[PDB]
């Protein structure tokens, strides 16, 4: 997998060497094709994993993501052509390159055989992200948000560093292939009960768990649209990908060491879903929607039943695409409105007829409408959770009712009701804004036709 | 300085560490340490400002008593073994003295009070020498005697330094002292692995030298001893803003950059030796060091602090360039990580 | 560590014994990296000194890309030796002190009974 | 090119990684042994050199 | 030692006088010269860990 990567690196030379006026089209047009080369990995004609080479591999779980990581770079660069079009021609070429490095790094992290290669690349992605959030962040508080995003991930990260070096000494190689075909069975000691927490905690932090998710609402609030898309679509899912590949070892402990997180997540799912119900900042509501719909995932990567896992793989890819779509349209309202407040800007369909159709489809993806991969995902996690304990439906049942309420409230108070009297007149929709959306949903429609590709390792 | 004097001093400041390293007769190692003490004091008071005399008088007393303690260890050994050099048989207290003493000259842990203060009153230039070409000498003496020193003490001085360095740095706003504090911290990691794998001490030093030397020549390019002063870097010289950003995050352990390797292999070696207690606590507060590094990042790069009109005047004039060393030592430092296996 | 080994060359860079090892291919990814590492140093310099970034010092750019690379071949040539000594040393010991490193026997998975923890 | 290439490539990747793993662990055991044993080329700490002991006939007769 | 510029250069400015059995002036043998020899020709080729 060096075509999904080397051609990517070369994007950096192109963003720099290219003309200031033509820099945007060379980069966006080329990475669209970079995504097309990424699609070749999907050609798996047998169940064996495609080990491209010693360090680089792609199995069913990584492949559905590498393609998404390559896909969003085009979109990210199309959603940030407006803001970042007021810059000095060298601030742009920095932002474009920053976005380019994220998927170079993220493509490799999702396509990495050695778990510590994951760690080095895993924690590197913070550098590009923190720059995108802090350097271009509009609000006074991004310095703070950046600190929260760096420390919560970093304090979790050093325990994983110690744990992975620890298993290398215990087993003798951090190669995901071998670690899988070798006998690593923890022994339920008090210490192992700590190892397990060391490995999972760093992944559980960037996958916002109810206890440590305050970093994500603060980060996406002041982050520029491209950073918020990256955090929701690819960055948070880095934590999920890690939990799937790391729990191959630590096989016995999670049977009983998971209860704490599972309950934290399911109760967390309800409270995070509910506070979405009365949050005035739209970007705030989407972020907590992201916490709740990701709290379902940590509760399926821990129950560990075949269906959970691919419920997880289905939902992660699906929610990634949906969340960005929501964060992308939130930005289009923010740029014309100039405020994140949900109460202002009422009645837009009256003035932006189509964006409202995109808003409606994004919300229906947000809630579980049935001919969507989003629902298949939740339906499956719901099933397994029920298997874990029939009572789980109650808590995963209060979340579904709340999820319907906030998803439609975003449509009802932003895209319906009487028009706002006279905010700065709202200029019509650009074709870029609409495509950036179409590019998010057309793939959501196509993937829903053949869900098999994003089903995970389990199935 | 009459250029002749400059030569004699500089030769001594350079013959000082070199005799230490080359000789085996400890005595000759002691005088190497003594010559470094004598040579550095003249340069320290070059401005001869009231702050400077204070700096040198502290540096000298701290250095002198430690030098006398190191000599006492050699004198005691001479009577416990006729040899003029530490051996397997050496009384444990004899070696511990040498650790404390040498940990004072290097300024590690509970003896970390002199360094921040002398780093504050000396010029940026002599600051570098006082931080990096004066650590080579004592460390050489320790690295030579590693097989014999105590694993317990070193670790305590190691952990303490890491903490003191980190905590001290958080509050400081003067750059010279932020660096002094970082050096205390890095010096700590170095002395942590000495008992186990000296060869890694020599990596955690070089990388520190290849990181700090560019960082200081950056601070002085604009001669800013204040963060507020380095924050207006964007107006005075915009290009160094990019690398100053990466070098400081490299000084802390963040993974893509070269700075991770020293911490990573030291942690790998300590876990190989089973200190998974000690290594864990060190790595954790090591993360505190990055917080103050990033706070500076914020002021200098990620956010643009307001500047002064008189600055437009300094832009007009051609900026005297930064030596080539900056580049070669900025890149070899910010990104060599892809070449780690051969470094270790 | 590896110092104190018999025959150690007290101050030599790479003992001739390292002649036995294969020479590093000049295009070894690593030496090529050092090259790029170098080009960047050059470009960076131009930038910090405020010169046209790429179109200036085309002589220097060469000195850099060619100094770093030169350094590489002769360094890697050594680091490669050091690692090679490590095996000579390591493998030898495994034998000279055989009992301490016995070849234990591993049973087929049939014989071994690994406890089955149901997931349910 | 086929199912054959990845299956055979993955087995080659596993053999390199399995062999690297066994050796890395054996290093840690050899390095534990030579440190304490001191019977191997690594961890051979120095003692004075007999090349300076003066074996000359000295003045007193008991040298 | 750390940098053996002495062995390399072949010079011996610091080794000739490190132990009591080294050449004493006018060959006035030291005291304990009967033993240090016996204790360093023993520990020669045997590293410290096994000179102890």
């Amino acid at each position: 997998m060096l075509k999904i990567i080397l051609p990517s690196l070369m994007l950096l030379p192109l963003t720099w060497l290219s003309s200031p006026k033509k820099t945007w089209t060379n980069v966006t047009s080329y990475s669209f094709l970079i995504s097309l080369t990424s699609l070749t990995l999907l050609w798996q004609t047998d169940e064996n994993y495609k080990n491209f080479s010693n360090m680089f591999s792609s199995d069913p779980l990584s492949t559905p993501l590498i393609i998404l990581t390559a896909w969003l770079l085009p979109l990210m660069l199309m959603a940030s052509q407006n803001h970042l079009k007021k810059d000095n021609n060298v601030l742009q070429k920095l932002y474009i390159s920053m976005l380019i490095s994220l998927q170079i790094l993220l493509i490799m992290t999702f396509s990495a055989t050695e778990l510590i290669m994951f760690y080095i690349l895993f924690e590197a992605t913070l550098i590009p992200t923190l720059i995108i959030i802090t350097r271009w962040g509009n609000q006074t508080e991004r310095l703070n948000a950046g600190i929260y995003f760096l420390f919560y991930t970093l304090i979790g990260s050093i325990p994983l560093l110690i744990a992975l070096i620890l298993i290398q000494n215990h087993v003798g190689t951090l190669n995901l292939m071998i670690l899988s075909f070798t006998t690593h069975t923890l022994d339920a000691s008090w210490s192992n009960n700590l190892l397990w927490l060391a490995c999972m905690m760093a992944f559980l932090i960037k996958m916002p768990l109810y206890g440590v998710h305050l970093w994500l609402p603060k980060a996406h609030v002041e982050a520029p649209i491209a950073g918020s898309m990256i955090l929701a679509a690819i960055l948070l899912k880095l934590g999920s990908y890690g939990m799937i590949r790391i729990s191959i070892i630590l096989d016995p402990l999670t049977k009983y060491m998971a209860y704490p997180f599972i309950l934290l997540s399911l109760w967390g799912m309800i409270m995070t879903s509910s506070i979405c119900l009365r949050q005035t900042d739209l970007k705030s509501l989407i972020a907590y929607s992201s916490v709740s719909h990701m709290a379902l995932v940590i509760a399926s990567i821990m129950i560990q039943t075949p269906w959970s896992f691919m419920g997880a793989t289905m939902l992660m890819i699906a929610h990634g695409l949906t969340s960005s779509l929501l964060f992308c349209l939130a930005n289009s309202n923010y740029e014309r409105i100039h405020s994140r407040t949900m109460i202002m800007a009422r009645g837009l369909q009256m003035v932006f007829p189509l964006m409202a159709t995109w808003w409606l489809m994004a919300s229906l993806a947000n809630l579980a409408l049935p001919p969507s991969i989003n629902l298949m995902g939740e339906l499956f996690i719901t099933m397994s959770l029920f298997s874990w304990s029939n009572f789980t439906i109650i808590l995963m049942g209060i979340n579904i009712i709340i999820t319907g309420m906030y998803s439609m409230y975003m449509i009802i108070t932003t895209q319906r009701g009487k028009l706002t009297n006279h905010m700065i007149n709202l200029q019509p929709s650009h074709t870029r804004e609409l495509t950036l959306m179409a590019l998010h949903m057309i793939p959501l429609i196509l993937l829903t036709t053949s869900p098999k590709l994003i089903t995970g390792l389990t199935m | 300085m009459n250029p002749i004097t400059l030569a004699i001093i500089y030769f001594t400041i350079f013959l000082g560490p070199v005799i230490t390293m080359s000789s085996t007769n400890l005595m000759l190692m002691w005088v190497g340490l003594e010559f470094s003490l004598l040579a550095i004091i003249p340069m320290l008071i070059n401005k001869k400002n009231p702050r400077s005399t204070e700096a040198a008088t502290k540096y000298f007393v701290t250095q002198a008593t430690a030098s006398m303690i190191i000599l006492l260890a050699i004198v005691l050994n001479y009577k416990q073994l006729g040899t003029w050099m530490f051996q397997q048989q050496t009384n444990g207290l004899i070696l511990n003295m040498t650790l404390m003493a040498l940990s004072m000259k290097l300024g590690l842990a509970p003896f970390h009070f002199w360094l921040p203060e002398v780093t504050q009153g000396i010029p940026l230039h002599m600051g570098l020498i006082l931080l990096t070409w004066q650590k080579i000498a004592p460390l050489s003496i320790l690295i030579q005697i590693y097989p014999l020193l105590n694993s317990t003490i070193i670790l305590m001085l190691a952990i303490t330094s890491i903490f003191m360095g980190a905590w001290g740095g958080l509050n400081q706003t003067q750059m010279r002292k932020i660096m002094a504090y970082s050096s205390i911290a890095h010096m700590g990691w170095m002395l942590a692995i000495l008992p186990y794998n000296p060869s890694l001490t020599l990596l955690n030093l070089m990388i520190y030298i290849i990181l700090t030397a560019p960082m200081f020549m950056a601070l002085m390019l604009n001669n800013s001893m204040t963060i507020n002063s380095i924050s207006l870097l964007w107006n005075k010289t915009p290009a160094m803003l990019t690398m100053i950003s990466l070098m400081l995050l490299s000084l802390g352990g963040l993974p893509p950059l070269t700075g991770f390797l020293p911490k990573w292999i030291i942690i790998t070696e300590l876990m190989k030796n089973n200190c998974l207690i000690m290594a864990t606590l060190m790595a954790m507060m090591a993360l505190l060091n990055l917080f103050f590094y990033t706070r500076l990042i914020y002021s200098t790069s990620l956010t643009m602090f307001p500047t002064n009109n008189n600055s437009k005047m300094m832009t007009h004039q051609t900026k005297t360039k930064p030596n080539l060393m900056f580049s070669t030592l900025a890149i070899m430092s910010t990104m060599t990580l892809p070449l780690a296996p051969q470094l270790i | 560590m590896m110092n104190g080994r018999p025959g150690h060359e007290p101050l030599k860079f790479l003992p001739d014994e390292a002649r036995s090892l294969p020479p590093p291919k000049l295009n070894d990814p690593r030496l090529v990296y050092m090259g790029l590492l170098g080009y960047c140093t050059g470009l960076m310099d131009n930038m910090l000194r405020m010169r046209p970034v790429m179109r200036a010092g085309l002589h220097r750019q060469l000195l850099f890309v060619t100094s770093f690379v030169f350094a590489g071949y002769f360094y890697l040539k050594r680091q490669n030796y050091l690692y090679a000594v490590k095996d000579h040393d390591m493998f030898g010991y495994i034998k000279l002190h055989p009992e301490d490193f016995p070849e234990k026997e591993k049973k087929t998975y049939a014989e071994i009974l690994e406890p089955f923890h149901p997931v349910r | 090119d086929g199912p054959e290439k990845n299956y055979e490539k993955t087995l080659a990747i596993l053999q390199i990684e399995s062999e690297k793993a066994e050796l890395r662990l054996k290093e840690q055991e050899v390095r534990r042994l030579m440190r304490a044993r001191g019977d191997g080329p690594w961890y051979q700490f120095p003692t004075p050199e007999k090349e300076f002991i003066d074996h000359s006939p000295k003045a007193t007769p008991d040298n | 030692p750390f940098l053996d510029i002495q062995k390399k250069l072949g010079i011996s400015l610091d080794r000739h006088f490190m132990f009591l059995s080294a050449e004493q002036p006018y060959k006035n043998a030291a005291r304990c010269h009967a033993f240090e020899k016996e204790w360093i020709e023993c520990a020669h080729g045997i590293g410290g860990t096994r000179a102890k």
Binding site: - | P341 | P6, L21, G92 | - | -
Partner: peptide, 27 residues
Amino acid sequence: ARPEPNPVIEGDLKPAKHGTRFFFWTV
């Protein structure tokens, strides 16, 4: 009796096995 000299590792160097075996470096 003078203690026996440590034994001597013997042979000729051969390129290291599988290369630097550092974390994930095919090398």
